[PDB]
Symmetry: D2
Subunit: 131 residues, 4 copies
């Protein structure tokens, strides 16, 4: 068994779990780049104590390199839990994140997200960096 | 020894390590709220393989409640490392994050950040939520 | 507001939430050291979908140094959640961890743990390292 | 591009990066199970400021279920960094972890590990749980 037998892709217009990347197509070398990743972008995903998106992580795959590099892991850790009961707490964290990178070579952005009951999901997008 | 003997505060206008919170003063109940937290906001912080900000986490403290709740942990995991050598890799993750919460009671936002060589730093800001 | 206003200590013989450190009193320089940290050590803590320990992190404070260093963050991420319902899933992760460090100066081990509804808890223990 | 194009397998007797799982073949329902995962098990892996294993995470795949479940993420966050220079700090965290689970159905344990310069690696092992 390989992990990727359990990492799903899909069309975000059909599937709430798909992590959707927003990033520029092309950037200057070393400039700060905003990458937004959102689960439940078009089709909403629940955020209850019982059912919620736990995290998004982002990898960068430089063209011609053997590896990926973990840009970050972004955890969404409040889901309405409380002593007074599930789903009546004060705070919820939505599965939306903006991270900022500086790139100096072209590559591929890969988003991986995790639901507490619906497993792993991915998407990817090329980014071109000026030479 | 208590951990808070090693969590520092300071003025971000004087100290690069202070995590700076940007969030509205007052919000509607259950509405989505953008919280931006940045280290090196006014005074830049390095991002080298040897010296970098590792993470920001955010807590929410509801008024009148005994506890804090971890809103999220946001890791910045690329710092120019590579097989070809430190500081010549393709990607860096800056210590800037935007997270989105839904709040239903007033409280305090607490930001905690960690430098790989300069330890822990904090700041906090009140937020009022419509009743 | 400071975070440490919301980090609690207590006697683990009276309080299930206290993270309990097991580590040797004295070690050789650079030798591998086992550090076990357990919540619910003597008094059990629940592990349900609604109520569970989320993580333990460990810091090391070297004697005479200004800072702490994050040894690790250890997340316990399965709590019986499933599509079929809360508390009938296949897997639970208990809040017990063993991490291995190599130390070259004496210091203090600090454990911090987080419950999804009962906030933050800490404990600490000195460790002496041969010179 | 799929993430699994960049998750490598190998024989731990030939490749230092392989995360090696130690867990019982068969366990009782709901009993506590020790799972040890180690990178550099037989062939050592460096732990320097420039080159180190960042984390191990563990997934559980229940037989007949569509998904994986994140058992935990275990971060190794000290690598000799210090103000005084790289590789002369007081503390290193080795890429060894013991986590404890309670299982109530049979499945597969999947270990995923990440090197700061050599990307992602995996291994897996079946576990049978009494019915
Ligand atoms: Fe889901
Ligand atoms: Fe610093
Ligand atoms: Fe609790
Ligand atoms: Fe490596």
């Amino acid at each position: 068994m390989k992990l990727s037998d359990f990492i799903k892709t899909e069309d975000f217009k059909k599937e709430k779990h798909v992590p959707v990347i927003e990033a520029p197509e092309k950037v200057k070398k070393d400039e700060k780049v905003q990458i937004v990743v959102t689960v439940g972008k078009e089709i909403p995903h629940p955020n209850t104590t019982e059912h919620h998106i736990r995290w998004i992580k982002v990898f960068f795959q430089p063209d011609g390199d053997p590896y990926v590099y973990e840009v970050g892991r972004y955890e969404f850790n409040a889901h309405g839990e409380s002593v007074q009961g599930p789903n009546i707490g004060a705070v919820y964290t939505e599965p939306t994140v903006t991270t900022v990178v500086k790139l100096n070579r072209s590559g591929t952005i890969i988003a991986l997200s995790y639901c507490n009951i619906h497993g792993l999901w991915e998407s990817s997008q090329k980014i071109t960096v000026e030479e």
